[PDB]
């Protein structure tokens, strides 16, 4: 586990993330798909090595010793806003459960869902509150990745705002 276990936000491509994992925003074929599942295919191909995984899971292959986490968020295209609610959380957990038994002291994670999964709707208090409720029970240092220069404003409020 991390000294004092922390979280973090940074407007940068996950791609170059400076943790002992990442999380990828996949779809459920194992596809390279676009946004940070293009960028997280074109570092680590090899781990897109039976990848496919459904709605509200993850999925852990390794690259080399690297580990990428494929986490599958609902499309709210696709789902009702109760279920995908749901499945939102639930994916989230998986993650919880991935990073805890790799044994690794820091990790790399998106917002699922907040992107072309979104449904059209600004979801970053949703994905992020689900985040933080998988999250607060591990002890690995995690890092939120985001591109957008007022959603870093907001991560990082939200962040400071439990202290
Ligand atoms: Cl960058
Ligand atoms: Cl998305
Ligand atoms: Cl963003």
Known sequence: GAMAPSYRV??????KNDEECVVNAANPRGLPGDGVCKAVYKKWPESFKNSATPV?????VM???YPVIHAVG???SNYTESEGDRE???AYREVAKEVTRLGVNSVAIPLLSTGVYSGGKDRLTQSLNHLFTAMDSTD?????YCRDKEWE???????????
Do not use: H, W, Y
Not at 10 to 15: L, P, S, T
């Open 88 to 90: 939102l959380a639930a």
């Open 10 to 15: 940074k407007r940068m491509d996950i791609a």
């Open 153 to 163: 404003k907001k991560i990082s409020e939200a962040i400071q705002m439990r202290t």
């Open 74 to 76: 609902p499309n709210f």
């Open 140 to 144: 690995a240092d995690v890092v939120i």
């Open 63 to 65: 690259c080399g010793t």
């Open 56 to 60: 509200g899971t993850a999925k852990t």
